[PDB]
Structure 1
Amino acid sequence: XXXXXXXXXXXXXXXXXXXXXXXXXXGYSMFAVGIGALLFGYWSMMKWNRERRRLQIEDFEARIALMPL
């Protein structure tokens, strides 16, 4: 009996298949989150600066109140 190297292909490994595809981001939907984070960013920040004004006037009031200084 002769024994040589046997042939096997099975699945053929798929000859040239695309793996690159669009994922997560679509296009217009990313701008809704992108610019949406900006509008949420300013509104949250400016409310803190209005709360800073409560401290600001109260800080300068200490100088006016102190005349024996």
Structure 2
Amino acid sequence: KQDMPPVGGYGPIDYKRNLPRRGLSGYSMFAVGIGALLFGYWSMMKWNRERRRLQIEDFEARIALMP
């Protein structure tokens, strides 16, 4: 008399197949790429030109002496 089949309690689990967790698509990408890229170029011309100012300063001490 002690056999298995239970009265209730069932799901089931799915046979489904989906995980569309997107994801900033469709022209939202290529937008964070370009602006941060020119931001790095914007970081230039305030350092290389600044080091160029120090570069003439470095060559200044050479020319002032040597007579």
TM-score of the superposed pair, with normalisation by structure 1: 0.77
Give 3-state SS (helix, strand or coil) of 1:46's partner: coil
TM-score of the superposed pair, with normalisation by structure 2: 0.78
Amino acid in the other structure paired with 1:15: Y
Gap runs ≥5 in structure 2: none
Structure 2 equivalent of residue 49 of structure 1 = 48
TM alignment of 1:1-69, pairs within 5 A: 2-7=1-6, 10-19=10-19, 21-68=20-67
Q: Could you say what the CA RMSD is over the residues aligned between the two structures, in angstroms? A: 1.9
> How many residues get paired?
66
Amino acid in the other structure paired with 1:24: G
Q: Percent identity?
A: 64
Give 3-state SS (helix, strand or coil) of 1:27's partner: coil
Greater per-residue helix proportion: 1
